């Protein structure tokens, strides 16, 4: 029971968007050159994410070294000031966070060509400065951008998106208010394809609605891929112009 107009009869949402529109998606490449080999600053809505890629480099412990592939590590730092109400405890060892880190690794292990970087380590540090729904999808986009900036080989883009289901209606790119009022589905889409790297459903969804929700997410993720690709060619082109 929600007293707010999550989806008005006029087809408008609480923030003004319609059913099908992505939130301001502003990417940023090479934000921390003196701190990492690759870096990206993501702004998807009110979400603010710093992503640092450090590597490939020498492992700090020879015990943890693979002679056939690189070691991929991801640590997500959800700051205590990410949400309106400051969290008293840290989230560093939170099971929810360990699953997120694990999830992200399992995603890019099959995309990043770790096999061509044996006896090395790729460390991915993430700092979530502000959170407002769809943080998982934003985490995916931040890593993909930062990895590319580091010149680390990968097969394709991985775009992340979230889709809510309020009653019958499907809502693209939901915020914190919408996620609190309905079940959401987080989708990671490889490139322009229909193949999902990540399918995440944590709340109840009717079996009949799931296929349609996936269809919305994939279409929306393709737009995220285009925006990421666009901003990347723009950054590339300028560098090429100035360097050459």
């Amino acid at each position: 029971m929600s007293r707010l107009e999550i989806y008005s009869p006029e087809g408008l949402r609480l923030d003004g968007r319609r059913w099908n529109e992505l939130r301001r998606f502003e990417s940023s490449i090479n934000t921390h050159p003196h701190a990492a080999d690759g870096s990206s600053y993501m702004e998807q809505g009110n979400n603010k994410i710093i992503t640092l890629v450090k590597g490939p480099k020498e492992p700090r412990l020879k015990s943890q070294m693979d002679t056939s592939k690189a070691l991929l590590n991801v640590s997500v730092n959800i700051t205590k000031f990410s949400k309106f109400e400051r969290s008293k405890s840290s989230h560093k060892n939170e099971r929810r966070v360990l699953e997120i880190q694990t999830s992200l690794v399992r995603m890019f292990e099959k995309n990043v060509m770790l096999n061509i970087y044996p006896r090395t380590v790729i460390d991915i540090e993430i700092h979530v400065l502000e959170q407002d729904g769809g943080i998982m999808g934003s985490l995916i986009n931040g890593i993909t951008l930062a990895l590319i900036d580091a010149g680390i080989s990968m097969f394709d883009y991985i775009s992340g998106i979230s889709v809510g289901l309020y009653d019958t209606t499907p809502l693209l790119d939901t915020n914190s208010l919408e996620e609190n009022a309905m079940s959401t589905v987080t989708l990671g889409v490889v490139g322009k394809s229909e193949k999902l790297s990540l399918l995440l459903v944590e709340d109840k969804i009717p079996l009949d609605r799931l296929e349609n929700v996936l269809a919305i997410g994939i279409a929306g993720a393709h737009r995220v891929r285009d925006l990421m690709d666009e901003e990347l060619r723009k950054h590339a082109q300028k560098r090429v112009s100035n360097a050459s």
């Binding site: 007293r3 989806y7 008005s8 009869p9 006029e10 087809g11 408008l12 609480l14 923030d15 003004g16 968007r17 319609r18 059913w19 529109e21 939130r23 301001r24 809505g45 009110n46 309106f84 109400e85 019958t168 209606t169 499907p170 915020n175 208010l177």
Partner: protein, 443 residues
């Protein structure tokens, strides 16, 4: 700042502070400014070209009639834009089948009504949802439209910004509907709006005070009766005071019972107390109705019938619990706040004693409610002779400290007494029974 997007959509920052449990939270949400907000008028020939389909692939219907109620110049054909106050006060008149046919309800108004009253907001939405060929209500999302969206000026109260927002909507509607010769009338009781129009520096706008607007309609005499309106009661506490009182175990809320055998004594059911706390007196009841959720404060023990600090009040509370077990003396209290009124449309009849047949102008009369546990209400009317022997529906407006009786204004004329039509209809709606025919959306 404000960012422009690809769809011609804009986005800004809506930031407000909400107080919860003595806490202060800065809430910040993003606010998108669109460019495809339909006027929802049959006359319009531009909006249908820029409108887009809903999640269910359904374009919104333009319902506002191309030939609305025509009034004496310079009003002519016109649409009505409502203010927040005129909605909260005369929702009954807004449901009257004999007036308000084409009405535009701004988003900012709809939002304020939702926060101020939950119920009225539902009734207003029903009018929008339920629109037919007799009554037509829409919701123009003015806050989401880039053309009408205004932002707070330096050193400006939120109430003046919102009034300026509504006024901006009327101007936009006025300019937008010029080729169709349809003017817009702003029905508002607010003092503030007029000054901005008296200068008329930027644009013109026709605004009538609720009463002033009614006096411009063809059926003014038929709908004027629906216009909402040392003795002194102790003022109710401010809102902050009772919330802290409940939290500090000083004040207590519950449902009050008032018997028809005695209107000068009430009793509240409190969880902390075994036997119901009595409320003796008319000042102590403080304009409370039977079934109302009231907040009461325990009177001193010397007021008991058969303090300064909060500490003493909690001690008084304990002495009250002891006294209830002893069954010798019983604790009394006084209502200082009304949490939830049990008010609903009330059926009654004019008392022949308070109406003068010789009077031709407007006069004050009394109406005897069908509820024997309820007091009588004062009514301003001119058709006092036409409502003499009839079952009428009235709604309360206010019951302030300096008036011995609550004040109410008539809503509808059910009929003559002891007739099968009037008595059956009064019988149904007194027991909350919807007898109206099923809406089009239902059928």
């Amino acid at each position: 700042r404000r960012k422009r997007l690809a769809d011609g959509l804009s986005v800004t920052q809506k930031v407000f502070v909400r107080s919860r449990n003595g806490g202060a939270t800065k809430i910040v949400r993003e606010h998108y400014l669109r460019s495809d907000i339909p006027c929802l008028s049959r006359s319009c020939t531009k909006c249908p070209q820029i409108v887009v389909p809903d999640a269910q692939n359904e374009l919104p219907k333009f319902i506002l009639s191309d030939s609305p109620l025509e009034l004496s110049a310079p009003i002519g054909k016109h649409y009505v834009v409502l203010d927040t106050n005129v909605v909260l006060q005369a929702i009954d008149l807004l449901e009257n089948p004999n007036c308000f046919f084409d009405v535009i309800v701004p988003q900012i108004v709809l939002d304020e009504v939702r926060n101020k009253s939950y119920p009225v907001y539902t009734r207003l939405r029903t009018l929008c949802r339920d629109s037919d060929d007799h009554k037509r209500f829409i919701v123009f999302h003015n806050e989401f439209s880039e053309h009408t969206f205004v932002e707070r000026l330096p050193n400006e109260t939120i109430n003046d910004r919102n009034n300026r927002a509504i006024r901006k909507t009327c101007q936009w509607y006025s300019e937008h509907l010029k080729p169709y010769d349809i003017n817009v009338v702003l029905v508002t009781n607010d003092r503030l709006n007029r000054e901005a129009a008296t200068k008329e520096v930027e644009s013109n706008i026709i605004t009538k005070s609720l009463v002033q607007y009614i006096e411009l309609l063809p059926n003014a005499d038929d709908i004027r009766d629906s216009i909402p309106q040392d003795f002194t009661f102790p003022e109710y506490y401010s809102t902050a005071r009772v919330m802290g009182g409940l939290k500090n175990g000083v004040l207590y809320q519950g449902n009050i019972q008032i018997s028809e055998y005695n209107f000068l004594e009430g009793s509240v059911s409190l969880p902390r107390f075994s036997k119901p706390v009595l409320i003796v007196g008319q000042k102590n009841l403080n304009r409370a109705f039977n079934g109302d959720q009231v907040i009461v404060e325990l009177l001193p023990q010397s007021e008991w019938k058969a303090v300064i600090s909060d500490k003493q009040r909690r001690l008084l509370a304990k002495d009250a619990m002891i006294a209830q077990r002893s069954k010798k003396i019983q604790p009394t209290a006084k209502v200082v706040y009304i949490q939830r009124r049990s008010w609903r449309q009330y059926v009654g009849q004019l008392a022949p004693s308070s109406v003068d047949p010789q009077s031709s102008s407007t006069q004050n009369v009394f109406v005897i409610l069908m509820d024997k546990c309820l007091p009588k209400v004062r009514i301003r009317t001119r058709r006092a002779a036409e409502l003499l022997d009839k079952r009428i529906v009235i709604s309360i407006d206010s019951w302030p400290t300096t008036h011995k009786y609550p004040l109410g204004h008539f809503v509808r004329d059910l009929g003559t007494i002891e007739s099968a039509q009037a008595e059956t209809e009064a019988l149904l709606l007194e027991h909350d029974v919807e007898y109206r025919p099923f809406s089009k959306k239902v059928l």
